[PDB]
Amino acid sequence: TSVPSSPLDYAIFSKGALNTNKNLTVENGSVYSGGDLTIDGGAVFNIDNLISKGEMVINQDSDSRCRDNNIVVRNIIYVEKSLKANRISPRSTNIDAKTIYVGQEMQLYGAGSYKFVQLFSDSNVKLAGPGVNMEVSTLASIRGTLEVIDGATVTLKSNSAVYCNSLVVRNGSRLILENGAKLYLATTPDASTIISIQNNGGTISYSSSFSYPSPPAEIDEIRNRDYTSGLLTTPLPADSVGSNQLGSTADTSQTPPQIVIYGESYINDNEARIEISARLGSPIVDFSTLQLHLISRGNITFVGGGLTIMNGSIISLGSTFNINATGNPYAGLTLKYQMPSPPIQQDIESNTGIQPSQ
Numbered sequence: 001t002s003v004p005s006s007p008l009d010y011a012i013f014s015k016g017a018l019n020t021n022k023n024l025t026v027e028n029g030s031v032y033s034g035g036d037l038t039i040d041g042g043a044v045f046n047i048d049n050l051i052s053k054g055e056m057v058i059n060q061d062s063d064s065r066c067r068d069n070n071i072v073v074r075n076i077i078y079v080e081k082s083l084k085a086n087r088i089s090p091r092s093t094n095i096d097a098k099t100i101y102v103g104q105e106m107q108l109y110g111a112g113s114y115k116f117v118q119l120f121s122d123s124n125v126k127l128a129g130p131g132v133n134m135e136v137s138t139l140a141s142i143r144g145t146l147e148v149i150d151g152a153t154v155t156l157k158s159n160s161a162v163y164c165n166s167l168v169v170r171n172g173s174r175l176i177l178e179n180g181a182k183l184y185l186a187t188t189p190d191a192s193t194i195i196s197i198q199n200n201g202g203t204i205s206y207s208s209s210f211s212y213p214s215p216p217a218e219i220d221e222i223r224n225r226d227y228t229s230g231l232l233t234t235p236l237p238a239d240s241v242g243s244n245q246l247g248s249t250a251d252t253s254q255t256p257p258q259i260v261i262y263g264e265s266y267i268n269d270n271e272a273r274i275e276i277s278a279r280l281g282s283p284i285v286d287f288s289t290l291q292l293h294l295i296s297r298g299n300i301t302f303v304g305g306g307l308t309i310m311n312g313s314i315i316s317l318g319s320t321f322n323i324n325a326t327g328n329p330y331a332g333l334t335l336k337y338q339m340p341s342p343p344i345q346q347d348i349e350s351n352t353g354i355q356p357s358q
C-alpha cells in the first residue's frame with residue numbers, strides 16, 4: 001500500500017504532462033506524471049503504482065502493428081482529474097488494479113475488462129459501450145452516479161460493499177451482484193434500471209442512509225506530496241566526450257555496468273549510444289547490455305525502426321514530456337525497471353537536488 005516518494009523508484013517519472021509512445025511495455029517500478037498522463041495505444045504494464053496529477057487518458061489504436069492495452073497495477077492508480085478510456089474497435093483496454101482513485105469523472109468507453117479491488121471516485125463513474133465490463137472485488141465508493149449503458153456491465157463480486165449516490169443502467173446493460181455483495185444507493189432508481197440488476201444472493205439498500213468510505217491514507221499522501229521538492233534549475237550536466245550535448249556518469253563496479261545519461265534539452269538514443277560508448281570506453285550497438293537511466297528536461301526519442309529494449313529508468317524534469325519513436329511509430333519500447341546503484345543514485349541526487357519530504 002506504500003507509494004514511493006523518490007523519482008528514483010519510478011520506471012518512468014515525469015514532472016509535468018507525460019505522453020507515452022505506442023507499444024510501450026513496462027515491467028516493475030511505478031509510473032508518475034505531475035500533469036496530464038496520456039497513454040498511447042498498446043500499453044502493457046505490470047507496475048506497482050500509476051499516478052497522474054492531472055487528467056489520465058488511455059487510447060486505443062486499431063493499426064495491426066499495435067495491440068490491446070493490458071495494464072496491471074499492484075497497488076494504486078491515482079488520477080487527480082478525470083480518467084478516460086477511449087474506444088477504437090476492435091481493441092480492448094484491460095486494467096487490473098488493487099486501488100483506484102479518481103478525483104473527477106471515470107469514463108470507460110473502450111471495451112475491456114476493468115477489475116478493481118477498491119474503487120474511490122469523487123464524482124461519476126460512466127461505462128458506455130459493448131464489451132465494457134467492470135468488476136469490483138471488495139469495495140467501491142462513488143459520490144456521484146454509477147452509469148452503466150449501451151452494453152456495459154458491472155459485477156459486484158461476493159461480499160463486496162459498494163456505496164453510490166445513484167444508479168442508472170439502460171440500453172442492454174446489466175449490474176450483477178454475486179452472493180453476499182451489498183449495494184447501497186442514496187436514491188432510488190427508475191424501473192428500467194431496477195429490472196437491469198441481476199441479484200444473485202446479494203442485498204440492495206435503496207435510498208439508504210450510510211456513510212461513504214474514505215480513500216485510504218495513501219491517497220491524501222499522494223495528493224499532498226510535492227514529488228519534486230528541492231528540485232534545482234541548474235541545467236543537467238553535459239560533458240565534452242561523446243556527444244557534447246549530453247552528460248554521463250558510469251558505475252563499473254558491477255557487471256553489467258550502470259550508466260546515467262543526462263540531456264538537458266532532449267535525449268535521442270543514437271546520441272545516447274555515442275555518449276555511452278565514450279564513457280564506458282567500448283562499442284555499443286544497443287542497451288540490453290546495460291543498466292541505463294535517461295534523465296532529460298525535454299523529450300526522449302528512440303530512432304530505430306525496431307523494438308528498443310532497456311533496463312533502468314526514464315526521468316523527465318522538464319515542463320512536459322513525450323516518449324517518441326520516430327523509426328516507425330509502432331517500433332515499441334520495453335522497459336524493465338531497475339533501481340540505480342548507490343553511486344548513481346547519489347550522482348542524480350546531487351545534480352537535481354530532489355529531496356523527498358520525510
Ligand SMILES: [Mg+2]
Nearest residue numbers: 239241243246
Ligand atoms: Mg558528452
